[PDB]
């Protein structure tokens, strides 16, 4: 029944593959190969040579068909690809064939492609193939970073699988303020946004990773000094509420570094001890980080006039 039938699957796939290759050697670049490969590529989208066969067929058919006949084939290809993506949304072959197809169309509908991306990202907000495809589409349609920035906000606040959305922001933000290291006002707004995230969900590692980047991405003004001090106290508050939360402990150390390495030396060293106890797998990392910070402190101490 179950195991018995996949013998029949094999021999059909096998026979269909046989036919495709025989046809290909014969120079038979026609719709029969499209039909044969549709049957195989659905279950086996990583069979790259068959995607190549489809492209060779479509290229050949384009030569001996009317514009409207070629347009029909394209629309059928789009539908085929969408059905394939529903079954396996992470196959490199499928996404690339779609890219190849859209890149050669005279009048592509990019807004429709962006919507396909929105839909696939609703199902899996971490699908990097889809995010990469979206960027491709956004580039071709010349969609502005500001418009994509709005997209990332909705995704971040509506629910929590957010690493991919934060990553995208990290690439968009620099584009809005492109130097040949963010402006402080922009940084300050990002800090507020990410702080909201990791207090809403303190287990959300993506916000903590993105926050570490912001702590490097920009001498303290009174406002930045005050914001950072405020973050410090807020993380101590969280530390009381979630004493096993390692992300907040590490961020406390980093904040003190950002504030005044030498003034906070005592507290930094205490936090290292606590943090290693809470996150013993990272002990070797945390010792190397502490060693680095101590070396920096020695250098700061020696700069004293």
């Amino acid at each position: 029944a179950k195991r018995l039938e996949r013998e029949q699957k094999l021999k059909l796939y096998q026979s269909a593959t046989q036919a495709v290759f025989q046809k290909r050697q014969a120079g038979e670049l026609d719709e029969s190969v499209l039909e044969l490969t549709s049957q195989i590529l659905g279950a086996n989208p990583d069979f790259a040579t068959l995607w190549n066969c489809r492209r060779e067929v479509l290229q050949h058919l384009e030569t001996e068909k009317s514009p409207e006949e070629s347009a029909a084939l394209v629309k059928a290809e789009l539908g085929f690809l969408e059905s394939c993506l529903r079954v396996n949304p992470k196959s490199y072959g499928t996404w690339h064939h779609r890219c190849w197809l859209l890149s050669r169309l005279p009048e592509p509908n990019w807004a429709r492609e962006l919507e396909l991306c929105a839909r696939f990202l609703e199902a899996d907000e971490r699908n990097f193939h889809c995010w990469d495809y979206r960027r491709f589409v956004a580039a071709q349609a010349a969609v502005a970073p500001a418009e994509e920035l709005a997209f990332t906000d909705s995704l971040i606040t509506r629910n929590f699988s957010n690493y991919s959305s934060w990553h995208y922001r990290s690439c968009l933000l620099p584009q809005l303020h492109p130097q040949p290291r963010l402006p402080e006002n922009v940084l300050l707004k990002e800090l507020e946004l990410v702080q909201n995230a990791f207090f809403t969900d303190p287990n959300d590692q993506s916000a903590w990773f993105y926050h570490r980047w912001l702590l490097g991405a920009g001498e303290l003004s009174v406002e930045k000094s005050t914001v950072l001090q405020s973050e410090l106290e807020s993380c101590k508050e969280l530390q009381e509420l979630e004493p096993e939360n390692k992300w907040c402990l590490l961020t406390i150390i980093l904040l003190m570094r950002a504030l005044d390495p030498l003034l906070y030396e005592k507290e930094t060293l205490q936090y290292f001890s606590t943090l290693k106890a809470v996150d013993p797998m990272r002990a070797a990392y945390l010792d190397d980080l502490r060693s680095k910070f101590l070396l920096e402190n020695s250098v700061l101490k020696m700069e004293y006039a």
């Binding site: 094999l10 971490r126 070797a284």
Partner: protein, 324 residues
């Protein structure tokens, strides 16, 4: 949060004899026939894991050499299997195999070089084949293939470097293309690339190293990016990258070792992505290779760059300097 829990009776000993029997017998079948499209890499995974275990002789050298020769196309590129299309992925795998066998001149090396050269773009990137898919995976395949042939000078290295570095991200990692999110497999390809091209000083080793060691979950296993399940093959992608950048000690070796051993199938031999799952040769290689990086006594030292026995690379004088 997302993690596996290792049941109390998971294997906790290394079953090398079982794994060698498993690979020795592989492809004697649904899975096998359905994965013809990767055959050359499958052969690479099997041969390399066997060689790491000291059991290469049990595989069929002569049969594999004839197979490799028949998969080289007129363009110089090598396909996954006979009648499939040439690709950088299978070109690298083929060259890796011939290196293991000291049989590089079984194929036309000048044409392989010409093939690789031809796939570089103006921005320094590489396409996987004539159909133009761009991925830093293919930057790695290009330089690794050329390094093993002594022909790294055949490509535009500075441009290749520039492209890879343009794929570096806020978290210290690397993506497939510029603006693509970091993940462990990609990081391996780009750090491997940077090792081969002598550019490891451009990696933020403390930052990337941190992101990589944070892949280790309470189970001891490694995932490939934040918030995903662990998978034994990350014992390769993560550990190799950490070794390249001199930060292998930043993960817990004993807990990872116990996770990798728990992924073995004590009945069939082989390793699976996670304990109790069905094994495959891919996960068997990376389980064994990960254990070797951790210093497993019964397994040959492995190159973190090439994922081949170090003694093989020593023999051909191709041993990129690491961070330490």
């Amino acid at each position: 949060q997302k993690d596996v829990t290792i049941k109390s009776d998971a294997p906790d000993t290394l079953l090398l004899e079982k794994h060698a029997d498993y690979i020795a017998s592989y492809g004697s079948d649904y899975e096998y026939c359905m994965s013809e499209y990767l055959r050359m890499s499958g052969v690479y995974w099997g041969l390399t894991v066997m060689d790491l275990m000291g059991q290469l002789h049990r595989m069929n050298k002569e049969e594999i050499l004839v197979f490799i020769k028949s998969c080289q196309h007129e363009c110089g590129g090598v396909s996954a299997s006979i009648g499939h299309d040439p690709h950088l992925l299978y070109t690298l795998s083929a060259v890796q195999i011939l290196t293991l066998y000291d049989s590089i001149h079984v194929i036309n090396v000048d044409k392989v070089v010409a093939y690789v050269q031809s796939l570089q773009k103006e921005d320094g990137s590489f396409a996987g084949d004539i159909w133009g898919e761009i991925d830093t995976r293919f930057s790695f395949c290009a330089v690794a293939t050329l390094a093993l042939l002594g022909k790294l000078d055949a490509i535009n290295v500075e441009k290749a470097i520039e492209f890879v570095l343009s794929c570096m991200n806020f978290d210290g990692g690397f993506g497939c293309r510029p603006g693509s999110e970091s993940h462990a497999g990609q990081i391996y390809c780009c750090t491997g690339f940077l090792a081969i091209t002598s550019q490891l000083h451009q990696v933020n080793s403390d930052l990337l190293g941190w992101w990589l060691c944070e892949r280790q979950l309470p189970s001891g296993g490694l995932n490939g990016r934040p918030e995903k399940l662990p998978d034994v093959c990350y014992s390769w992608w993560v550990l190799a990258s950490l070794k390249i950048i001199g930060r292998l000690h930043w993960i817990d070796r004993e807990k990872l070792r116990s996770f990798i051993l728990a992924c073995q199938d004590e009945e069939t031999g082989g390793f699976a992505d996670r304990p109790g799952d069905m094994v495959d040769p891919f996960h068997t290689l990376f389980g064994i290779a990960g254990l070797s990086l951790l210093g497993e006594e019964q397994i040959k030292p492995v190159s973190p760059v090439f994922c081949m026995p170090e003694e093989v690379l020593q023999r051909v004088n191709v041993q990129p300097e690491l961070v330490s």
